[PDB]
Design a protein around this nucleic acid. Sequence first.
RNA 1: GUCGACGUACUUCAUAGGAUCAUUUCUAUAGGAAUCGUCACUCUUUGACUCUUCAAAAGAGCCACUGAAUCCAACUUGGUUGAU
RNA 2: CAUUGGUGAGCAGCGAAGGAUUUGGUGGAUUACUAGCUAAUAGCAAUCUAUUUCAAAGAAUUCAAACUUGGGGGAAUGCCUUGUUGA
RNA 3: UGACGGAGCCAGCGAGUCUAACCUUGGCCGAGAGGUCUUGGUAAUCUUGUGAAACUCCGUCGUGCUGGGGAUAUUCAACGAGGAAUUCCUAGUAAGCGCAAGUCAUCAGCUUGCGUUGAUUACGUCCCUGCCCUUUGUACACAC
Lengths: 282, 445, 91, 50, 125
Amino acid sequence: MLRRQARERREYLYRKAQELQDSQLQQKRQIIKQALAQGKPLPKELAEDESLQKDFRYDQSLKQVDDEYAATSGIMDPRIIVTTSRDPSTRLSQFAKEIKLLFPNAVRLNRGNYVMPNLVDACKKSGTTDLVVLHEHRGVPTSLTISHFPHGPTAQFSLHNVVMRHDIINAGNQSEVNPHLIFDNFTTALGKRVVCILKHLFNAGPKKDSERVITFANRGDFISVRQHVYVRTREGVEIAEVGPRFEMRLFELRLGTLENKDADVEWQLRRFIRTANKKDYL
Amino acid sequence: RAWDLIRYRNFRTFTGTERIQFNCLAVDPSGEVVCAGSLDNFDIHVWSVQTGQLLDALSGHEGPVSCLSFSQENSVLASASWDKTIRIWSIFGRSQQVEPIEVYSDVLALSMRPDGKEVAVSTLKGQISIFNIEDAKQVGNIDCRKDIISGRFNQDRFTAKNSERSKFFTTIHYSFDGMAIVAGGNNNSICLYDVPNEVLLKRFIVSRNMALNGTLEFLNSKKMTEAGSLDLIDDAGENSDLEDRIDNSLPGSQRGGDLSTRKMRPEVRVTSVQFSPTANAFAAASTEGLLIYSTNDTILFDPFDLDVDVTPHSTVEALREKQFLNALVMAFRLNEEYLINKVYEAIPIKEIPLVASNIPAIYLPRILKFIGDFAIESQHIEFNLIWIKALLSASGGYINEHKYLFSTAMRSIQRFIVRVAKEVVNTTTDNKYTYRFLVSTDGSM
Amino acid sequence: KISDLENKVTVSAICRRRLPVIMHRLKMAETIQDAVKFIEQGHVRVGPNLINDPAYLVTRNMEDYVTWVDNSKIKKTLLRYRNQIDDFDFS
Amino acid sequence: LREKAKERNPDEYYHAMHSRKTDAKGLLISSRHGDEEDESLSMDQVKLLK
Amino acid sequence: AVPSVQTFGKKKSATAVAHVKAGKGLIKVNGSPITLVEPEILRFKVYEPLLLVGLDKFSNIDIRVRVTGGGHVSQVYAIRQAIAKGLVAYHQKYVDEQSKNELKKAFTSYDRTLLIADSRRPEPK
RNA sequence: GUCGACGUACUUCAUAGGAUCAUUUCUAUAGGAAUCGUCACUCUUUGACUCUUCAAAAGAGCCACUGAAUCCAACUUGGUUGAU
RNA sequence: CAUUGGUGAGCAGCGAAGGAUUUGGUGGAUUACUAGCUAAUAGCAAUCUAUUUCAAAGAAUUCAAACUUGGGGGAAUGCCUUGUUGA
RNA sequence: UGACGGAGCCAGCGAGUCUAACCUUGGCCGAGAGGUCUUGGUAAUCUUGUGAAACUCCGUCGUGCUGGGGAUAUUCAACGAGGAAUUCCUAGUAAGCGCAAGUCAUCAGCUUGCGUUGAUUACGUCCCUGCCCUUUGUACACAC
């Protein structure tokens, strides 16, 4: 499966390069489709070439989730490994516990003497889909890295205002039912890519009367994560704050797993450009 | 897909969500669960049989799952794949436990022992490695690549001594007592070994045809000319009529369909072997057909601890002076089938149960397998059921605690009870109830 | 696109999908003639079973299993070029 | 070069791995004299040069 | 023109290459003899491929093992696996196959990690 | 936050004159040039065949009878008055 | 100090009027052994010819026959089918 | 499970003409700028590749902790493995041990890798605390 997954990556990124290469054909095919729709003349480049028209006879019978999650978006529920950095502190192990309670279908793995190459190999041949790696700074958890496993993308975030369900009070147990999700003003294309990354690690299709909600609210490139349970009363909704609250900032999104760091970057945070603090999702 | 052999129907069809082509399957003992493994997916698909859904997909192999089996006693799944790895899944009962066993080369043909304690794999080195399951250690291997008859094809340019094509076994099966292994592959020798001594019992040539390909190890050098062999010239345009002058063999086709579309001679090969559950035979699915091999005991005098005074004449003298137990065990020690038959029909009905209680413990599988393969065809139905009732009531605790010894002898007894005796009883029960209805009611006008 | 069904299906495409050409594009030989020579000489198996005719068509899944046979002199010489030759497992 | 090392394909066979050889560390031995001359000069050659 | 057989043993990051050739009987690890393998309480882990099958197997071959990497106990485990599978491979190739699989039965009945290392780990529970 | 109208700003779009070739004669023009049963020599291009290198890989396999070649051993001849 | 690298010089040991390596040719096998030829119930084998000719038998409205074509578009002149005109 | 003092021996990551102190005492040259030389003190995870530490082996000692101003050339602070409670954890795992890096966010009061040594105990059960699902078999035989 090493040979097969290597050449499956090779073929997928060949198809990716081919589509961005010949996606001018998609738009001049759309141009002559709309020109046959409303009977208007064809521009000169399309009017003089005989090849694209006699190919349009065939291509006339051609014609949402993205490329890595498309094959099994709503079909198979995810399987998520949650692990810490290495020799973790006790508040980081508590945080990894709380994150595996946050995601259903997530188990927690103990990290120590696990090289991240063969941890990626073990994970993606025992068939998990996601890996969430947590990093601390003297107790305070500072980063998390979400990896989608069939050679998919890794989004690396840094966590900022972390309050933990342990560190509040002995408040009881969590709900662990399949939750609804709330994704607030992820307006740009990077926001939609991160929405897809972040929501394809919950189990698909929660109940309509499921009583547990977990919200990712983008507020100036700072995705505020809160978790809630509720009961819909006669005048409004009464919201109770269960589970950890923090703010994650996306600082990298690359197109391989964790193991290589030779992956083609899709977006990494340009921090010292001149226009650093003017635009969001920069 | 599942087939009910009573109403002749396909009552279930299990598919994966991936549309892959399955190359091996294995069913649970109590047919709750059916698993199947492909040659292009690395998972093992586990469907339930009652609800038709996919129950799970077991992942963990990193090569195509070549062979599966379910242990018929403790219900553990032994899978084996081309990543040189056999792998033991405890599926039922809260565990979900996987145990990998590494092996030397890539496994084809796993078979499980009848009592589920052990599992023997074939490997592409041409070796058969027999593993314990509970303590997953190698209990013993057989080196099986030198006792294989790999022929030379007509079209290949490398000798049979050097051909690497078919020096391994792609299908193996344990004996039903658990002490032998029959095996065969894409070569024309089917070999049966005994596992406790790890030695070759016997090697059979599956075909001596020259119209098939992989038969001769040594091809005739009169056919090799100054341009190619003489059996590679297609003299199919010398044929009388068009329908066999036609060449419809599209080029690189191996193992497709429709033998006319291949251009090459059919190779000789065995795809599956099986030991018979009832009577001392095996069957191998060659290209000529289902070859069926069995031992008959009309020939091959093979006695069992006889002495100087144990003779056919001495057996019939003890029968004429009517010591029936002495005559019967003298017949067993000669182990001549006509003597066992003669004494077995000379014993009378009043002292069937005395003789049957006093047969020694070592001659018990002999009399059980004799009564089995006799009473399938012979017409003394009440006599053979008298003997079976006497033997099972006499020593049926010994059979119960030596199950696998009497597992291919007691299973041919209930090929006699349910297939001739119960059919006869069904006919007379039909006659009884038609008589009762035809004389107990009122057909008046 | 569907005009690939008329433009870009081609005997040279079906031929590029043969086994010596898959061998050459997998770098398992130096050229297509030497790949034909090597599998006429009976070194190349796909999966477990040896393949002997050069016309064999090697699909997308089945080109992850083109290897040499074990005990082949060519497998022996590339392992011993990188002096990783383990004579335990015959090569 | 790291991309090539990952995509190596270890069933690779070029015929010049009958002359070229790899040392114990795994790297390549390049004969620093030539490869148009032979390194060891035979005994008649050494007789004449001496 | 001389018979020689090279095998490899490996544990955690140790590696041990054993060359077996037809010789006088001398067993060497890193140039020093086999009786100087440290840490000297695992010298019998190195010695057990020898004593399992008797020194008359070794009395005509001479093995030499180059060990690199790992720590102390990884090195003695790679040494013993290299010695074991080197002796079995020499007996397959230049001595008879009956003795080869008698040696395989002896080493496998003691422990088959003398012949097959545990290679790919872990498990995602 | 969404489309019209105007204003603005930008992109693209010219084909003529002449010659030659294209009809198993003739591409339409008389302004143009070619109709011959082979004799030899030299030079040049190409392909086989035999051997072969990079550089290997596989041996239609065994046994016998005969013949040849090479390297040692041996004998003979020449050789410190000088072989290689 | 290794060479599990080349080339040489020699011992021990092996060792019956020599030894080693390569190669051309032929023969027997490579499937299970009933003889040669022809105009064949017999001739011949040194020969079939100067009896080798006659008679008899023998001729499907099947007076039907590409089961044989790489794909898209055509087919002037052909060719096929059908109609038709004049004999 | 010590304290000294030698010896043995084992890794894996890491290669941007780049990698890195401070405060002084003075002599001379020079117009000054500054240069050179000399000197003492403080700080120090060394400087780019060789190598580790734990470990193994060998000799010696031998097991009731600590203070400043007073007295001659003893008596007035914290502590000898940490309470109630609470948290986390199932195999190359827990824990020990060092070695490198410092990667546009985070980090140096540290963070992340990298190897080395590597176990005890569960691997069952829903009894407790919980959480979730179903309550027409539907889905086609047979059986229930």
